[PDB]
């Protein structure tokens, strides 16, 4: 409530400047509370970013779980596109949290562990689907599925986030989903 106001203030300010340049007083002020009232809800501004990242990561995770439970009736290319799109739309809808959360992996063990935990879960699910595709005779047994999954997930992390940040170099945001789908489909189904 005042908690949701603090989180919304932080996400808004992170569009303008880095967490380094945002004070607890900036977050309190934005949320219409005092500094000590802020400390009732969060121990630090770093905790606010951790909560924002945790919400975005869990949103992507629950969207991927929804696909898993409600698979689309489409070809393998459109299937992998639907999965990559969960990450494109979820993180691409929260670019300031994505940028700040990735930067915080350097300084926060809690942010690093959160990111690590979910990447392990997403890679494990990727590998499980590749193994299912191999089991049904649709994909060839080339690389170990978990190693292939790891590299494809790490490609998407770096490529999606470079695109969102407009880094030089980056794939244009309007081309990045097609670019990643090509590489996933050719590497998963290619001999």
Ligand X SMILES: CCCc1cc(-c2nc(-c3ccc(C(=O)NCCC(F)(F)F)cc3)cs2)ccn1
CB–CB of 84/157 below 8 Å? no
Binding positions for a copy of itself, 127-156, rule CB under 8 A: 142-144, 147-148, 150-155
Task: Output 64 or 152, the one with its CB closest to a copy of itself.
Answer: 152
Q: Is 164 in the site for ligand X (CB under 6 A)?
A: no
Total residues binding ligand X (CB under 6 A) = 18
Phi and psi, residue 12, nearest 5°: -60, -50
Stretch that binds a copy of itself, among 23-31, 37-45, 90-98, 164-172 (CB under 8 A): 164-172
- Residues 6 or more apart whose CB falls under 8 angstroms from that of 156 comprise 84, 87, 180
Selection from a copy of itself, ligand X, none that 137 binds (CB < 5 to 8 A by kind) is none
Reading the block at residue 11, the tokens are: 């996400």
Binding-site partner at residue 120 among a copy of itself, ligand X, none, CB < 5 to 8 Å by type: a copy of itself
At its nearest, how many Å lie between ligand X and the CB of residue 92?
Answer: 10
- Residue 176: CA atoms inside 13 Å, Cβ hemisphere, count? 24
**Can the peptide bond before residue 160 be classed as cis, meaning omega within 30 degrees of 0?**
no
Min. distance of Cβ 162 from a copy of itself in angstroms? Answer: 6
Query: In the complex, what is the shortest distance from the CB of residue 164 to a copy of itself, in angstroms, rounded to a whole number?
Result: 13
Shortest Cβ 133–a copy of itself spacing (Å) = 14
- Closest C-alpha to 53, from 19, 76, 78: 19
Collect all residues with Cβ–Cβ distance below 8 Å to 85 and sequence separation of at least 6.
Answer: 177
Residue 31 within binding range of a copy of itself, rule CB under 8 A = no
Picking from 87, 120, 100, the residue whose alpha carbon sits closest to that of residue 52 is 100
User: How far is the C-alpha of 121 from the C-alpha of 111, rounded, in Å?
Assistant: 16
Any contact of residue 108 with a copy of itself (CB under 8 A)?
no
Subset of 48-77 contacting a copy of itself (CB under 8 A): none
- C-beta separation of 104 from 44 below 8 A: no
Residue 34: contacted member of a copy of itself, ligand X, none (CB under 5 to 8 Å, by partner type): none
Binding residues for ligand X (CB under 6 A): 67-68, 71, 79-80, 82-84, 87, 91, 122, 125-126, 129, 153, 156-157, 160
């Amino acid at each position: 409530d005042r908690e949701l106001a603090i989180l919304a203030t932080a996400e808004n300010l992170l569009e303008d400047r880095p967490l380094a340049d945002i004070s607890v007083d900036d977050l309190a002020k934005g949320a219409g509370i005092s500094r000590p009232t802020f400390y009732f809800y969060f121990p630090s501004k770093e905790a606010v970013l951790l909560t924002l990242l945790d919400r975005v990561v869990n949103q992507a995770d629950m969207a991927l779980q929804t696909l898993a439970e409600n698979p689309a009736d489409t070809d393998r290319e459109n299937m992998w596109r639907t999965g990559i799109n969960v990450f494109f739309e979820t993180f691409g809808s929260h670019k300031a949290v994505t940028r700040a959360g990735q930067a915080a992996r350097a300084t926060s063990v809690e942010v690093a562990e959160l990111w690590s935990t979910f990447m392990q879960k997403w890679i494990a699910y990727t590998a499980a689907v590749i193994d299912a595709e191999r089991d049904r005779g649709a994909a060839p047994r080339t690389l170990p599925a978990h190693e292939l999954a790891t590299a494809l997930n790490l490609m998407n992390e770096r490529t999606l986030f470079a695109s969102f940040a407009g880094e030089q170099p980056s794939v244009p945001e309007a081309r990045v989903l097609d670019t990643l789908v090509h590489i996933w489909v050719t590497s998963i189904y290619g001999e």
